[PDB]
């Protein structure tokens, strides 16, 4: 009954928090302590989510690379007593979001799924960022979709339905996979299946998440390969 | 100097002619002999090219599955004295263009290129067809681009430059790979590199090949891995 699985990428398939922490400490040396940089990374992600919320209200799309770059410039001025960055380093730091590493279950989970389903990315990141993330995270897709293709971010209905028509299948034949409830709820509005992936470390050891009970979505799993088993995909 | 290679798919990476010939003979049984069906397949390809030519001159885009469907309906009326097809069979025959098998060099050639470059399809086929062709032809891409995304077919400039914008690179950082000269000449007009792959059997054993001289395009090869070697990509194990 499903033909394709569409995936959230940042956080759902990739550990962006550990990636961005190590990336920044690699670019900036002992100019910044780990505790301060991790705090910057958490506010960076928060800045990103807040700007996308405003843009969704405004019915606007804008390059997400620019969203990361501009919010980082803002944070760099706020933390300017503790450390500084040249313009070149700002570009290298922003590049960290295009170098996300994946959770360990992800590459083999996707391969297990492909025996029965098309697998495609549906990310709010720009098209070039998700292509680059495919290399850093070792993701091999049937197709790569981005908000850039549709002029709107998730949860907007044109993203899910544009994905379905591009893929030539019915929305009810799409299973949306995510670690973010808001993206599953939005796929539900257009008729797609829902699969929630719990990522307890998406926001680090002291992170908090709205809890998801069993039965709220069609599937509730702790890895992509667990999802593949519950969908009937043979192992290896 | 290049960041990404963009590929023509039908014919350049896939043997569409053998695919459609065997596919049709499987769906239609003894209703059609091989010789007649091969001639229909050849006219089917010609109608597709003629219709894309017209739409390009009109600056219009249309679904390519519908181009294939409508041309087959036209051909079925021209051959209607010899055999017929139900509407269900027309759908099944049209699906043949979404099941293309690749030339034998293509999977290991694409894998060899990825050590140094992004590789992406840039096809005039619809997005869903190129996604399906990835399975039948075992193509593994960094991204899939279609004329459907841009509202225009190659050779129009909005396809190559739209591809470059999506990939976050300059048109001059793209190497266009194709077995059709017209798609290379148009990529050159936007500043991209050109790589011609000779496919002597694209049109069958007695088919006519474009005869490309040396010096016309940046690269002239007989396989994707030969192209990968000339681009400095390390060999596969």
Author numbering:
A (entry chain A): 11 to 246
B (entry chain B): 11 to 247
Task: Give verbatim excerpts from the published study on this entry.
Microbial epoxide hydrolases, cis-epoxysuccinate hydrolases (CESHs), have been utilized for commercial production of enantiomerically pure L(+)- and D(−)-tartaric acids for decades. All these three CESH[L]s exhibit high sequence identity (>60%) with L-2-haloacid dehalogenases, which are members of the haloacid dehalogenase (HAD)-like superfamily. Studies have shown that both RhCESH[L] and KlCESH[L] adopt a two-step catalytic reaction mechanism by 18O-labeling studies.
Although the previously proposed catalytic triad of RhCESH[L] consists of D18, H190, and D193 (22), D193 should not be the catalytic residue in the catalytic triad because D193 does not form direct interaction with H190 in the solved RhCESH[L] structure. To elucidate the mechanism of inactivation caused by D193 mutation, we determined the crystal structure of RhCESH[L]-D193A and RhCESH[L]-D193N. Comparison of these structures with the wild-type RhCESH[L] structure shows that these mutations did not lead to significant changes in the overall structure (with an r.m.sd less than 0.24 Å). However, the mutations of D193 disrupted a salt bridge with K164 and resulted in a significant conformation change of D18 which subsequently formed a new salt bridge with K164. This explains why the mutation of D193 caused the loss of enzyme catalytic activity.
